[PDB]
Design a protein around this ligand. Structure first.
Ligand SMILES: [Mg+2]
Ligand SMILES: [Mg+2]
Lengths: 86, 132, 94, 98, 195, 133, 101, 113
């Protein structure tokens, strides 16, 4: 009814949403600019802290000579053996 | 026959500790969780961040106190403040112990921008639960 | 004594020598009421920051326990058994 | 008609000072800075001196690492931004006399 | 080479200030703790692990601190600071009469460095129109406007605000919304008169 | 023997404004251990009763969430491995509680948390009517 | 020092999608809206078509952080099922019990 | 002022002493502010530069350069609705959206159909 339609118009004017009617393809814009995109959400932008920083820090600290990296010692020892054996 | 966080039964000359001796299906029944946080509970978030960061904590501390520890660690995170507890041997000198304690605490605080503390319990020889 | 009765406010950066040379005067004068009052001095309020350096703290505790010993001594020895905390030097044990 | 208790204002440190004055100092206990286990427990004045000054030297060392490699500690993971936790930068910029 | 001194068990007396030796939360420190409490699955013809290397007591949460004596002491200490509730307010009806507009927010607290979480922004509020409208026309108007924000069984109207990130912003928007709603329900229109 | 003479009390000021009136402080503790939850709630209720406020204790049910993982790596669909995250709730309500009492109590409890627990506060405060209405 | 070159490409795609997130949202609204001119819709269509590659949020994948495994990764934990089982067995994480119900 | 600051830091260094209490180190942590502000409002800081609810929601003052019937009006009204519905973004990002749409249809003003 026109009464209920204008009731909805008034409620929309009061609570912020649009009074004029709108289709689903038009409410697409509203809800899209309401909810942020997955590309911008930090759930996607930050999937994990950077192995860059982690490994660079641990490499520099090994060069300092404090963190005895067993894996790296293993690796470089086998590489020394390979370069000795040709 | 499942192979998951368990040591093979040997002739009986392999000292084994409680946590690594007991099975992973006895964790909640006869063990405690090494870490304690609320990211696993409902309503919280950043649980993946919690896991990755605490794994990095354990790795870095295990490798910056190498040869002194003889068991897993205990993490205790109350709101902002973080606490670590370790069991070590009297291998090296208290000078080195305190120096590395302060060094690691300072570095971790600077990295995680978070208040951190760590405690260590000395033992002459690592406690053994059984000989397997 | 009136200084201790009133609350203190720090204004001069040279308050570290205060503690040590005060206890030196305490060891020179050798009075039990003087020792009581000089203990109440740092025991009144947030003034225990004036101890600071370990050398001055060492001199203070040494002369304090020395006068307390050279004052029964049951109260003194139980005071010590309660408030050793670091291990003191030989002098005090002598 | 109606009575209401009046509002009060406290400092971040006032409650902690209250809780601290509530409890006296621990008796027969080494300083809180020093560890609790007996092996690390410093049992003499000179060795305790060496121990805590080594702690301070380690603090200085950490300062050196952070001010030599800020880019590692550059990320602002903690929500409240704190310059004391931020890396310090004693780096002269490009030539500009003013 | 170096030796460790014996624990504080024999040193600590039976009369002792436990709230003082454990002011804040801290680990178990069995060397300082005199109690022989053990915890662990005992072996056949065996017993649980001694407190020396019992890291499971550390794994579990810690409550040695804050003894009943400590709790009492701190409660009597903070009794000086806590205030008194108005004695005139001793019932729900009287409280709702003195202050009809109820409003409540909420937020979690969790372990970690960060502290914000969007649920801090939400805030709900409630008010019953049985005593506030004082009329019938605007009553019918506003009850026609609101679709499900009301409750006729318990006689309460409830509205939620989260459109702003700040709690204070949500509060201000909610109050201004109620104000404008009352101001727009006061009047009427021709299509509302013709029904 | 060492008992301090003058206790240093923090400064306090009763500002001009009136304190806010919280109708109900309803706190909800989520945990993993019934025993830890019981200890924490006993702590809380004892502190509240010694501070002189009303109390009430309820126990919502246990919530569990499970999800299935492949027990092996490459090819095994019959054999799976499961897990379960158990969260346990505890409610504590406080009625007729002044704003400053709420401040002190929440500071106390928020400093007295254990680690493996989450804490949700719901604060309900009544107020008078606006002026524009 | 990422795990591998596929993780490298995935992170590049994620960064590009983030830094073109808002713009893609705006032009996607301008496209999928209907009451506006269809000529403008087509304009925005070729705009999106000319946008660079690795810019859409659809090319990325919810891969693992440790083992870089794309499949069997939980969105909550972001860890592969295998690494999750590993940590659950070693008791590294908190609050996870075996569903022996 | 400068030498006053030098004297103040000298006084601070003289005051500095080792703490012997968990409460004391907590006082220190609170002094530098790393310890959270209890009660946890989750809004200690990040006030959005004193922004306002009406500045967030009511975009009518931002919407002035187009009539109230056209399709650009329709689209920008829906945009303002979505922006007001979204609490995550602030007035800055909302006006950024609006001005970018302004530039869009004003550089595509060749149509106005
Ligand atoms: Mg099987
Ligand atoms: Mg996909």
């Amino acid at each position: 009814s026109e009464y209920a339609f204008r009731m909805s118009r008034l409620s929309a004017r009061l609570f912020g949403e649009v009074t004029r009617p709108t289709n689903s393809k038009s409410m697409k814009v509203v809800k899209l600019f309401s909810e942020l995109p997955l590309a911008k959400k930090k759930e996607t932008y930050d999937w994990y802290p950077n192995h860059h920083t982690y490994a660079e820090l641990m490499q520099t600290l090994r060069f300092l000579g404090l963190y005895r990296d067993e894996h790296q010692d293993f690796m470089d020892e086998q590489k020394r053996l390979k370069k000795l054996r040709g | 026959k499942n192979r998951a966080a368990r040591v093979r039964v040997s002739k009986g000359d392999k000292p084994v500790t409680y946590e690594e001796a007991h099975a992973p299906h006895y964790i909640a029944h006869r063990k405690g969780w090494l870490s304690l946080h609320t990211g696993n509970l409902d309503g919280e978030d950043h649980a993946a961040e919690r896991t990755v960061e605490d794994v990095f904590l354990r790795k870095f501390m295990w490798g910056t106190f190498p040869g002194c520890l003889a068991d897993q660690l205990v993490l205790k995170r109350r709101g902002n403040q973080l606490e670590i507890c370790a069991v070590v041997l009297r291998q090296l000198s208290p000078h080195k112990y305190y120096f590395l304690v302060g060094y690691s605490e300072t570095l971790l605080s600077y990295f995680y921008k978070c208040p951190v503390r760590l405690h260590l319990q000395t033992v002459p020889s690592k406690v053994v639960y059984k000989y397997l | 004594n009136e200084l201790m009765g009133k609350r203190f406010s720090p204004k001069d950066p040279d308050d570290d020598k205060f503690f040590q040379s005060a206890m030196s005067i305490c060891s020179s004068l050798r009075d039990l009421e003087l020792a009581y009052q000089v203990h109440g001095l740092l025991k009144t309020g947030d003034n225990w920051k004036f101890i600071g350096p370990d050398q001055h703290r060492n001199f203070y505790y040494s002369k304090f326990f020395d006068l307390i010993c050279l004052m029964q001594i049951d109260v003194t020895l139980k005071w010590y058994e309660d408030l050793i905390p670091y291990f003191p030097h030989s002098q005090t044990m002598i | 008609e109606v009575v209401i208790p009046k509002k009060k204002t406290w400092d971040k440190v006032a409650v902690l000072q209250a809780l601290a004055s509530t409890v006296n100092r621990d008796t027969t206990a080494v300083p809180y800075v020093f560890q609790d286990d007996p092996y690390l427990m410093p049992a003499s004045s000179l060795e305790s001196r060496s121990f805590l000054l080594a702690k301070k030297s380690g603090e200085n060392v950490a300062k050196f690492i952070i001010n030599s490699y800020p880019k590692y500690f550059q990320k602002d993971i903690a929500e409240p931004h704190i310059p004391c936790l931020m890396p310090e930068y004693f780096e002269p910029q490009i030539k500009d006399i003013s | 080479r170096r030796k460790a001194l014996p624990p504080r068990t024999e040193k600590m007396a039976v009369d002792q200030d436990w709230p003082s030796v454990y002011p804040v939360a801290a680990p178990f420190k069995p060397s300082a703790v005199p109690l022989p409490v053990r915890m662990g699955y005992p072996v056949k013809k065996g017993v649980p692990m001694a407190k020396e290397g019992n890291l499971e007591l550390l794994k579990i949460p810690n409550f040695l601190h804050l003894t009943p004596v400590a709790i009492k002491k701190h409660c009597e200490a903070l009794k000086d600071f806590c205030t008194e509730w108005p004695a005139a307010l001793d019932s729900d009806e009287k409280c709702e009469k003195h202050f009809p507009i109820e409003i409540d927010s909420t937020d979690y607290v969790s372990s970690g460095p960060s502290v914000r979480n969007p649920r801090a922004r939400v805030v709900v509020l409630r008010v019953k129109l049985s005593s506030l409208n004082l009329d019938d026309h605007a009553k019918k108007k506003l009850i026609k406007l609101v679709g499900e924000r009301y409750c006729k069984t318990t006689d309460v109207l409830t509205i939620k605000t989260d459109r702003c990130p700040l709690r204070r912003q949500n509060y201000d928007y909610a109050v201004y919304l109620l104000t404008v709603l009352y101001h727009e329900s006061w009047n009427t229109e021709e299509w509302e008169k013709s029904k | 023997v060492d008992v301090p003479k003058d206790l240093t009390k923090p400064v306090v000021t009763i500002s001009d404004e009136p304190d806010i009136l919280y109708k109900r402080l309803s706190v909800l503790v989520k945990g993993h251990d019934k025993a830890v939850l019981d200890s924490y709630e006993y702590f809380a209720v004892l502190a509240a009763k010694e501070l002189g406020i009303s109390i009430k204790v309820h126990e919502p049910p246990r919530k569990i969430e499970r999800f299935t993982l492949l027990q092996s790596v490459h090819i095994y669909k019959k054999h799976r491995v499961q897990y379960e995250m158990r969260t346990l709730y505890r409610c504590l309500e406080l009625e007729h509680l002044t704003g400053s009492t709420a401040d002190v109590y929440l500071e106390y409890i928020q400093r007295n948390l254990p680690e493996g627990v989450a804490m949700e506060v719901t604060k309900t405060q009544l107020e008078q009517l606006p002026e524009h209405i | 020092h990422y795990v591998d070159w596929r993780m490298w490409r995935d992170v590049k795609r994620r960064k590009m999608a983030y830094e073109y997130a808002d713009e893609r949202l705006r032009i996607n609204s301008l496209r999928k809206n209907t009451i506006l001119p269809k000529i403008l819709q087509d304009v925005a269509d070729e705009e999106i078509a000319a946008l660079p590659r690795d810019s859409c949020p659809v090319r990325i994948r919810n891969r693992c952080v440790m083992t870089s495994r794309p499949r069997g990764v939980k969105r909550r934990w972001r860890l592969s099922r295998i690494v999750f089982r590993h940590l659950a067995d070693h008791g590294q994480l908190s609050g996870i019990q075996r569903a022996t119900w | 002022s400068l030498w006053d600051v030098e004297f103040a830091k000298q006084l601070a260094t003289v005051n500095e002493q080792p703490l012997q209490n968990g409460f004391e180190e907590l006082i220190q942590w609170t002094k530098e502010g790393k310890l959270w502000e209890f009660p946890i409002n989750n809004e200690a800081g990040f006030d959005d530069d004193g922004s306002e609810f009406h500045e967030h929601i009511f975009l009518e003052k931002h919407l002035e350069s187009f009539p109230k019937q056209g399709p650009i009006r329709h689209f920008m009204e829906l945009v303002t609705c979505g922006l007001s519905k979204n609490p995550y973004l602030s007035v800055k990002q909302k006006v950024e959206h609006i001005e970018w749409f302004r530039n869009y249809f004003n550089e595509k003003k060749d149509i106005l159909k």
